[PDB]
């Protein structure tokens, strides 16, 4: 009865620490770098879709933003890079990021109003502006009220507003900042002017500023935006003597956990998925990946490999322990059964057995180690993707830094639990191999001549009741 | 030949097999406190109480009987106070004088401008805000309005000359009403203005109605700075600045963190403090609680880490133990390996000294070597941020969990991986040892199979010890 | 006769530690942790570093008199800047986001100085106001790259300049505020009382006005020049307005970029040498994985980390086991076996004699090869920077970036020192594994014709020549004789 191994016609490779490309029976790459292509929904939330706007050119209702879908709960943002319609009116958005990271994910958003426009008896209420022109008319942003001189006067414009709602409400406020002292007149009549918001919380003046500057979409003048979260059943107060760019509307907002902003060119697709990159999402249980760094949701751990290739199976002979390779050259293609077994040749016949407990012994050993390797991965909720203004180059340079910084451990060791990893399975299985020889030439003893070839020669007859 | 086996219920996992028995184990993850706040490195924490650090430093009178030290490791405050500004208001980077404030190696109060050398100003004003036994009082640390009908241009300044850095803080009164102004103060387009070498800063105060806030409009905006050792501060005001009498001396040290809690101090002993109790131990890991301070273990999210140490209980790479020879013995007690010998003489079991000594010393290594490499500086973990700062809190966040989740992920794995190297190791030695014996008697034995040699020759007491020795001949 | 299968031994006293020893002696080692620099300051990629002397970013930007002899190239790698200049802001005062500006010209690929508002087109304004505490040779003299406008004649028309950005490249560009300390400098400097400095681009709104106050005396002065910076984009327009206190540029400097860097803290000097790794007590010329010659490095390094020693056992156990040959059955080493890792001795009556097996040693060495690279290959090094700037009121943010670079300090540490005891143990343990596989391919072949003496020796039951040697180290060897038997 002869003691061999199996061997196939697989011609996959892995690395071990000790050598590179050896040729094994099975193997199991653990590293994902395959995605689907589409933009989904993320844990059976879509994504806020854009378009060409921006978050600002949204919220303040660009007359551009007009066809634009909006959903009362979103699990990401899907924005352009560089979008396209932002602020008509030039000017600028305080904190800015931090406002689109406080929406990047909502329970609930709805738009309410709440100081009706026409409620400004006392001052106009229709200037707009062809920075903003809907048919080549002057027009404005839709959620919003620019508040002029009447007949020639500008009373102190006063107006609160309770939040009833029932949620956290996002205001958002302008600041006019004029061209020149004409403009100034012309528009408020008042030249001391002030712009004045107050909340439990807030308390801020802020007055405009007259200068000459370049024009961006034909204006001198600018708007300066910014905005406050009015907490349940607390009040919001405006007051000012000019140039006061007035809320129409609010936005109960209620979250519920934080996510990010996806720039990307796509469109949503009705498909779904844990795990958001802009190349299309992920679906696996793998422990790493090599898709795209900048993935929204539970994801593989980012890393910088081409391939992670895990061996299951042995070496494919067309070792530590000597045996494989070894003292019995090669394998055996007609063992089908399993990975070890007998041969056996005999005056009734010949044949080839796997030997089914060392077999699957062995199979549920490697099951496990691919198993560890895989569960024992912990994966949580990130953003990744992150938005600094031009003025936090350091703090984005801090979280590039840490962004690399687990780039490169996970890259080192992934590789190196690899390596590691192979040459203990391939050992395992010499190991097996090893010990399944020597349980036979334990009981045979004298009865047999040891070959050297994994081979026992009987001394006695031995036919299949002796086998 | 044979090996030790026990009533150990003891199980460890490895890459290969779950749930193994052996005949022992350590468990190398933490996961238990003391319950108790502590002492830290030999210095407490500042208790706060009901207080906010807000109102400590401006003298909420609802802060009176606060028990101050002159030198503190963290400092102990509740999730949300209670009493903070209790006139209503805010405090510009405060969450920056907070981390200041964490860890002070000595901290003094001292007089920088007395009360009642504000001749010219009224100085006596408070409010209900500030309310003690219904009387309106004010903050017990700070101080100016209009005396007989005037607000003269008032001044003030400070030399340190304290032999330490010295924080000041100072407030802008922001009224509901021009009323309230003039009737306060007197002029109207007043301000605010404070300077050192360093500080260059001029307020003007919000005139502007506001929700109340305990029942005020009014708002109080306060600030900071520290003055350097003998520079001097300046104050110059035509109206609406809240002065400060006193000044902080302070030397650091290090720096801490706040630890938001409900307990109070104890009067033990930690270096490393824990919200639901202080922590004890040499172990390299622990799950009791993230946010912790002092010289702590990794925190991991792992129940259990538990790491072999003996063999393979049993009542391999190796084929030996539970191999080829099939079962343990409780017989033996006196080590890991050894030999039975039936003899004309008696039977016996007797471990093998050698063997056993170097598995020992081997996998005492193997711990220690798990154990003394993990390196453990200070640290706070816990941080503040401001409602305006939540990308940077969420950076915070996504680092602290990175390192959470690599540093868990090679926990598990160590253990798996040297939890079958440990149980192939004990194989490998009886393996070993089973190979020395029989490389030795040669021919004068019967190679049983079970582990055992039987004698042609006859072996009493002596040639048993000749063979376990290496004698034999 | 007999054959003899053992191991080298050499003169080797290096040591090694592994998960279950300590101080194991080994044949051969190689050490995986840089610990040398070459003491210099170098260019970096082959490109210098800018020199700052004595001086800080300010007060070589701001054109301090003091920083008149700065060399200044128009393009550098990283920044050289003492901690702790001398000659930063000549006139008491400050300059915001200063930290932000020294992150952006860290690095650059192209810097250039151009004149954007010549001083002399400033006529209706006096131009050439100065400070004793910006003095050159007891005179008053001024940041030279900037223009104090003061009155003239009694008169400060409002001061209105402009420059629409032509260069071809973005340009930095630098302005100031004068904050008086009373009421009469403001009037005997200004005329005007209730003065403004308006800037503007397509970008920057901003409008500032001077605070008036006594402050302590700094260099003799209770006035600030308090500075701010914009990057003009190709093609924008910067708009100054004022009517007093405007500290007005007359350059503009010309930046194109690159990648980002960092600047450097030392006390030494450029010296022309090269290096894609530079630290402030030297450059690191290396392949190794792991670095513990100091933190704060900039290029592209290996891991730093905290541990004295990262050797890697490559020889084997020096001896003058999981598979219980070396210093197992097989007692010793032998020093007398130059060629190879294991081998025979084998004693003849044709004479004595060692030899390595040229094919287990190959192997071996092919195999412990593979190992080093491994470990060395695989680590990723990208350019960094490491040592940053933060501002007083940023200290929670220092914070974070210190727990950072802790984190992963510690992280590579424990990993890199634990990587070494694991592949040492292996390491032993397949040396073992490869003599106790030699001698069992010996005694598979001589079988019965040979006695096994069990220190690692067959002596033989024939005569066996060299011829017959040779078969046994050959795998030839057989058999038939048999011999004895008789
Ligand atoms: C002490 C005082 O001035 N009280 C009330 C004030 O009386 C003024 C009096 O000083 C003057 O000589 O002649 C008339 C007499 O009535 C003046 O008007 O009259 C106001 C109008 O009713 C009141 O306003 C309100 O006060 C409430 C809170 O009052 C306090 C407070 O506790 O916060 C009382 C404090 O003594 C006072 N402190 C100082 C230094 O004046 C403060 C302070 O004025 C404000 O806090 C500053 O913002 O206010 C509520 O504000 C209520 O809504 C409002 O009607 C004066 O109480």
Not at 134 to 161: C, D, H, I, Q
Not at 340 to 360: F, L, M, P
Request: negative net charge.
């Amino acid at each position: 009865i002869c003691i061999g191994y199996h061997a196939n016609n697989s011609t996959e490779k892995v690395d071990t620490i000790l050598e590179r490309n050896v040729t094994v029976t099975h193997a199991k790459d653990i590293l994902e770098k395959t995605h689907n292509g589409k933009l989904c929904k993320l844990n059976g939330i879509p994504p806020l879709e854009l378009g060409d706007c921006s978050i600002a050119g949204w919220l303040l209702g660009n007359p551009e933003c007009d066809r634009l879908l909006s959903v009362p709960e979103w699990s990401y943002i899907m924005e352009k890079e560089n979008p396209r319609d932002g602020l008509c009116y030039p000017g600028s958005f305080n904190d800015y990021e931090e406002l689109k990271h406080l929406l990047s994910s909502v329970k609930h958003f709805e738009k309410v109003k709440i100081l009706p426009k026409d409620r400004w008896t006392q001052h106009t209420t229709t200037g707009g502006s062809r920075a903003c022109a809907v048919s080549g008319n002057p027009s404005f942003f839709r959620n919003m009220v620019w508040l002029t001189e009447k007949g020639s006067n500008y009373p102190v414009a006063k107006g609160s507003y309770n939040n009833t709602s029932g949620e956290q409400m996002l205001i958002i406020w302008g600041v006019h900042h004029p061209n020149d002292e004409t403009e100034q007149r012309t528009l408020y009549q008042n030249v001391g002017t002030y712009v004045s918001v107050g909340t439990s919380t807030l308390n801020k003046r802020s007055t405009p500023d007259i200068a000459t500057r370049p024009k961006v979409n034909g204006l001198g003048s600018r708007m300066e935006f910014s905005w406050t979260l009015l907490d349940m059943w607390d009040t919001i107060n405006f007051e000012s003597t000019g140039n006061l760019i007035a809320p129409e509307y609010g936005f109960k907002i209620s979250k519920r956990g934080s996510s990010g902003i996806m720039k990307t060119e796509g469109t949503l697709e009705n498909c779904e998925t844990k795990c958001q990159t802009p190349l299309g999402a992920i679906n696996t249980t793998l422990p790493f990946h090599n898709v795209h760094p900048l993935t929204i949701g539970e994801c593989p751990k980012y890393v910088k490999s081409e391939k992670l290739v895990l061996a299951t199976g042995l070496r494919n002979v067309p070792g530590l322990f000597g045996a494989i390779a070894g003292f019995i050259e090669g394998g055996w293609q007609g063992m089908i059964d399993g990975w070890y077994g007998y041969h056996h040749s005999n005056d009734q016949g010949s044949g080839y057995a796997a030997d089914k407990e060392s077999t699957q012994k062995a199979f549920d050993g490697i099951t496990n180690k691919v198993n560890s390797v895989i569960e024992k991965m912990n994966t949580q909720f990130e953003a990744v993707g992150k938005e600094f203004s031009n003025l936090e180059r350091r703090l984005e340079n801090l979280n590039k830094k840490m962004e690399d910084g687990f780039l490169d451990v996970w890259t080192y060791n992934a590789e190196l639990l690899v390596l590691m990893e192979n040459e203990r399975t391939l050992d395992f299985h010499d190991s097996n191999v090893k010990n399944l020889y020597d349980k036979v030439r334990m009981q045979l003893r004298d009865n047999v001549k040891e070959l050297g070839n994994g081979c026992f020669e009987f001394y006695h007859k031995c036919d299949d009741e002796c086998m």
